[PDB]
Amino acid sequence: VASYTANLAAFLVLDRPEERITGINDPRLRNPSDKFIYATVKQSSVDIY
Amino acid sequence: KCDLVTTGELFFRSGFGIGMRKDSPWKQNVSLSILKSHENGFMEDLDKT
Amino acid sequence: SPRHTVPQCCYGFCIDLLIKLARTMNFTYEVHLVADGKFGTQERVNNSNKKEWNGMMGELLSGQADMIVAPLTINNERAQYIEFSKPFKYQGLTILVKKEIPRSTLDSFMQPFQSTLWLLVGLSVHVVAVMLYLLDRFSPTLSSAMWFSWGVLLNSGIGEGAPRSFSARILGMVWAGFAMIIVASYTANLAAFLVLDRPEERITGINDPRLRNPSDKFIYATVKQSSVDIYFRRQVELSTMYRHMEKHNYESAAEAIQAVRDNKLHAFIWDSAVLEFEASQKCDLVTTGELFFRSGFGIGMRKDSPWKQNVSLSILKSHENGFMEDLDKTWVRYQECAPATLTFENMAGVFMLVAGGIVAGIFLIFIEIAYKRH
Amino acid sequence: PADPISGTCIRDSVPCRSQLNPEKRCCKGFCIDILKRLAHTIGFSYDLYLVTNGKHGKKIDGVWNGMIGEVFYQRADMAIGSLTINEERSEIVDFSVPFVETGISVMVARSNGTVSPSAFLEPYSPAVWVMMFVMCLTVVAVTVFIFEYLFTIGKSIWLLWALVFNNSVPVENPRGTTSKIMVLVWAFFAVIFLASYTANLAAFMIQEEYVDTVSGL
Amino acid sequence: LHKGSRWKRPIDLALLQFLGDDEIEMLERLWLSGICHNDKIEVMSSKLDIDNMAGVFYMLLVAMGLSLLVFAWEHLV
Amino acid sequence: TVVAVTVFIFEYLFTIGKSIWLLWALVFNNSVPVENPRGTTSKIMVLVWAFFAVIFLASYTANLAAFMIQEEYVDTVSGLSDRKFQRPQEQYPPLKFGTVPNGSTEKNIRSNYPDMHSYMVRYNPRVEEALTQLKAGKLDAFIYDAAVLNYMARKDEGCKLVTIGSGKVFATTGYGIALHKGSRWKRPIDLALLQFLGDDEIEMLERLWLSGICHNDKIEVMSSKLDI
Ligand SMILES: *[C@@H]1O[C@H](CO)[C@@H](O[C@@H]2O[C@H](CO)[C@@H](O)[C@H](O)[C@H]2NC(C)=O)[C@H](O)[C@H]1NC(C)=O
Ligand SMILES: *[C@@H]1O[C@H](CO)[C@@H](O[C@@H]2O[C@H](CO)[C@@H](O)[C@H](O)[C@H]2NC(C)=O)[C@H](O)[C@H]1NC(C)=O
Ligand SMILES: O=C(O)[C@H]1CN(CCCP(=O)(O)O)CCN1
Ligand SMILES: *[C@@H]1O[C@H](CO)[C@@H](O)[C@H](O)[C@H]1NC(C)=O
């Protein structure tokens, strides 16, 4: 029983949603993939930057 | 909108501006008016509203 | 110390490589250690930078030795003056830090609950038990009521005389439910503390904030007059680091490792091909981070030396087709040597409680027997 | 100050020339690095004139003392450093694009160790608690009916609740042929429920550092 | 700069180009950075949590009051 | 010691082995029948031990929650010279490890480790379209050029480790710029490349062109309690 509760606590503690982007340095953005679709507004300062 | 959350840190820190033509004589008057009125007692009033 | 050419005997990776090279091209070698221990760098003397080539590099350039077989890194400065053969070992700068033993915490068993919380439960038991006795005596004993309330909270079977009145029964059930909540909360809090209680994270590369923001509490250095010094000076982003390492820069690759073991140092930045050996042979140090100056070694020779072509071929053919594994697995790889566990921090508090109760129990029995005497 | 043998300033520095109405000093930092890059790009030759007549700038009976004072008049046509922008300084001088932001901000110490709220003892959803109560009543009714088929009236409810909590509570166990099976099946549910509840609290107790979020002065 | 100085335009564009590529990014990190710049630390919450303790005891007091009320109701007959 | 104390106290004011039986029951789950020794002070000793049982059990369960938090472990071969590869028929053989035949890696291994190549040719004339990377679920190890193996490992959906690093690579060589024999461009290019390694080169360029989603990571995994 103690092992079961400890295992459940480890699962619950480690079971969290995927981390957010957290800046332009995130590996997800630095390595674009078809599963991630990030864009901006056409003909703006973002395009020039 | 209570559905979206902004993540990351600003990476192109810049400002806005009331652009004018190069020969426009309003540049000095407008620049002073922004510094004096907007950003001493006015910016908080407008931004917080 | 004679301090004048005492005959010693050398052996190892480079010397083994040298013997192989001599056999395959007819050498006749006479090894000769560098006069002053120093890999080599360009020093400025009397407004003449090129005049000062300190270390073994000067010996080769001056004319004392025509071959520089040793763990000599390949970089721009040396390549401009001397000729480097094809690398015989690919490596790169890496950080070596002392292994942090995973000690425990929670010196006391009562740490999860504040002193006020323990008092609140302590008087809660007394108040609940007394009220139960009053309800039972109302008819809609104190000793029995105290035993029941204490037993339920402590999860003991000493409970006797269960409440009979419906009001007493409902109060008792809620009291038991509160007991489950308190104990479950304590275990959950302890699990969170234990899970989150881990030693400080290691450096993990040159990009760590600790290195990028040097502090007096962190002392990381390298070997004086080596390729590490040249690498940091050339870069401009690594401006803060160089000033810090220049202060505590050591004198040899062996002194620095000893300092790390003795705790005088905190992070050594050196060739990964050497640090990875020290970590393997010495079970006290662990190399962290990722290589950030990936380069190779080389048997440097003078620019006009005619040996360059048939040393470079000999390295590529013999060393790195059937030989590199033989040498590397014999002199570098052959030599080989978890969350903390509560040991005596939890027990000390709990054990003192058990012993403390035993002395009180001995006093209680003497008092109880004295009362029964009359 | 420059070292006795250093002579000229070392790399990553510029010759500071603190002047008044002689010693050589080395001036380095953020804005100096900006000045070096501006000189390299624009292509001029700078000459630092570290001021000593006052501070960053102020007006005294119609007299400007400080970097603005030197930039005003004609003593030095630049005041690179830490110069804020406001109407008065921008009225007599001509500033440039702000390369660093500033303002009257507020510093507040972060509240270490955010405490779990009062309602942190419920990892189970409200429907989770209600369903458990309804199941307990249904099981108790089933046990009493089974016992009646082959005494206990309110004991079944008492016994049913005791198992869900810590078992250390006196209770009379209804003897029977199949009623015991129901008690065990409920007992297993109690063990599974308690383990889940304790496991969740361990996840809830993991808090963060919360800093009071003022509205910005 | 001096009022009306011709250097305003060349310097203005020069600084605006710095913001594009490095400027604060490279320079501010070298000269205006600290150990814990971002910082995000999980803390094992101590169970003092008088809000947490109060909630559990508040329910206990309510149950205690309910028991007293039911006892009075039974004692009425 | 507690059991002896309880029996002595009870004797002062039956139970012989029951105290040991009762003492052990409390430390474990209390759901175990046991006769409780009635007394004036012996009960206090039982409660004090009972509190120790509750504190002990809570600590034990709390620690397992910390122990169950495991990581991802990758088998650490010796770098193509391990006993697993050479002379595989010594212990439980590893899943058949192969490579692209009729190339350069196959020639090197055959000329240097004939015994390993004998068994290593189980399934691997020419080509195989390097699909073994996608089929690395039925065979354990894959042997091929490290330059591309690193790229496919980084670019792959999810990712799989490569048993290679500074060492553990058999015939470590590099990528060059094949100039004509004796060409004068050798020196200027040699110094030019050596300067690139100083500042950017691989760092800037390799990150742009030879980087993947999970270049580096160490993911904590909630260990399933199968754990035979
Ligand atoms: C707005 O611009 C006008 C002119 O474009 C400024 O008027 C000048 O004010 C100064 C001082 O008050 C006088 O010496 C000048 O003679 C005025 N010029 C003219 C053409 O009359 C005015 O000061 C500016 N106001 C602001 C707030 O910038
Ligand atoms: C190493 O260099 C020497 C020359 O310094 C090479 O010697 C030549 O070898 C070829 C082939 O045997 C002969 O035809 C030439 O007459 C030799 N010349 C001299 C000067 O001896 C030698 O072959 C080279 N060996 C290696 C390992 O590259
Ligand atoms: O803009 C420059 O003049 C200075 C002005 N300083 C004002 C300080 C006001 P206190 O000393 O904090 O009460 C801030 C730094 N820049
Ligand atoms: C290399 O060849 C020369 C010429 O035959 C021979 O004298 C020498 O002994 C050989 N190797 C060496 C240097 O021992």
Swiss-Prot record, chain C:
Its family remark reads:
Belongs to the glutamate-gated ion channel (TC 1.A.10.1) family. NR1/GRIN1 subfamily.
The UniProt-reported impact of residue 351 to L is:
In NDHMSD; decreased glutamate-gated calcium ion channel activity
Q: Where in the cell is it found?
A: Cell membrane; Postsynaptic cell membrane; Postsynaptic density membrane; Synaptic cell membrane
User: Could you tell me which cysteines form disulfide bridges?
Assistant: 283-337
Source organism (scientific name):
Homo sapiens
Q: What is the effect of changing residue 361 to R?
A: In NDHMSD; loss of function in calcium ion transmembrane import into cytosol
- Origin superkingdom: Eukaryota
What disease is mentioned for this protein? Answer: Neurodevelopmental disorder with or without hyperkinetic movements and seizures, autosomal dominant: An autosomal dominant neurodevelopmental disorder characterized by severe intellectual disability and developmental delay, absent speech, muscular hypotonia, dyskinesia, and hyperkinetic movements. Cortical blindness, cerebral atrophy, and seizures are present in some patients. Neurodevelopmental disorder with or without hyperkinetic movements and seizures, autosomal recessive: An autosomal recessive neurodevelopmental disorder characterized by severe intellectual disability and psychomotor developmental delay, involuntary and stereotypic movements, spasticity, and inability to walk without support. Intractable seizures manifest in some patients.
Enumerate the Cytoplasmic topological stretches.
155-166
Q: What is the effect of changing residue 180 to L?
A: In NDHMSD; likely pathogenic
User: Reported effect of changing residue 349 to R?
Assistant: In NDHMSD; loss of glutamate-gated calcium ion channel activity
Mutation effect (residue 176 to V): In NDHMSD; uncertain significance; may affect glutamate-gated calcium ion channel activity; decreased sensitivity to magnesium block
Q: What is the effect of changing residue 192 to G?
A: Increase in glutamate and glycine agonist potency; mutant channels are activated lower glutamate and glycine concentrations
Glycosylation (residues): 26, 46, 213, 310
> So where does this one cross the membrane?
115-135, 167-187, 346-369
Full-protein residues shown: 446 to 840 of 938
| Name of the protein in its database record | Glutamate receptor ionotropic, NMDA 1
> Domain annotation text?
A hydrophobic region that gives rise to the prediction of a transmembrane span does not cross the membrane, but is part of a discontinuously helical region that dips into the membrane and is probably part of the pore and of the selectivity filter. The extracellular N-terminal domain (NTD) is a site of allosteric regulation to modulate overall receptor function.
Q: What is the effect of changing residue 192 to T?
A: In NDHMSD; likely pathogenic; changed glutamate-gated calcium ion channel activity; mutant channels are activated at 30-fold lower glutamate concentrations and 50-fold lower glycine concentrations
Intramembrane sections: 144-154
From Swiss-Prot, chain E:
Q: Which family does it belong to?
A: Belongs to the glutamate-gated ion channel (TC 1.A.10.1) family. NR2D/GRIN2D subfamily.
Q: Which disease is the protein involved in?
A: Developmental and epileptic encephalopathy 46: A form of epileptic encephalopathy, a heterogeneous group of severe early-onset epilepsies characterized by refractory seizures, neurodevelopmental impairment, and poor prognosis. Development is normal prior to seizure onset, after which cognitive and motor delays become apparent.
Subcellular locations according to the entry: Cell membrane; Postsynaptic cell membrane
Taxonomic source organism? Homo sapiens (Human)
- How is the quaternary structure described? Heterotetramer. Forms heterotetrameric channels composed of two GluN1/zeta subunits (GRIN1), and two identical GluN2/epsilon subunits (GRIN2A, GRIN2B, GRIN2C or GRIN2D) or GluN3 subunits (GRIN3A or GRIN3B) (in vitro). In vivo, the subunit composition may depend on the expression levels of the different subunits. Interacts with PDZ domains of PATJ and DLG4.
Name used for this protein in its record: Glutamate receptor ionotropic, NMDA 2D
Q: What does this protein do?
A: Component of N-methyl-D-aspartate (NMDA) receptors (NMDARs) that function as heterotetrameric, ligand-gated cation channels with high calcium permeability and voltage-dependent block by Mg(2+). Participates in synaptic plasticity for learning and memory formation. Channel activation requires binding of the neurotransmitter L-glutamate to the GluN2 subunit, glycine or D-serine binding to the GluN1 subunit, plus membrane depolarization to eliminate channel inhibition by Mg(2+). NMDARs mediate simultaneously the potasium efflux and the influx of calcium and sodium.
Q: Where are the transmembrane segments?
A: 52-75
Question: What's the domain remark here?
Answer: A hydrophobic region that gives rise to the prediction of a transmembrane span does not cross the membrane, but is part of a discontinuously helical region that dips into the membrane and is probably part of the pore and of the selectivity filter.
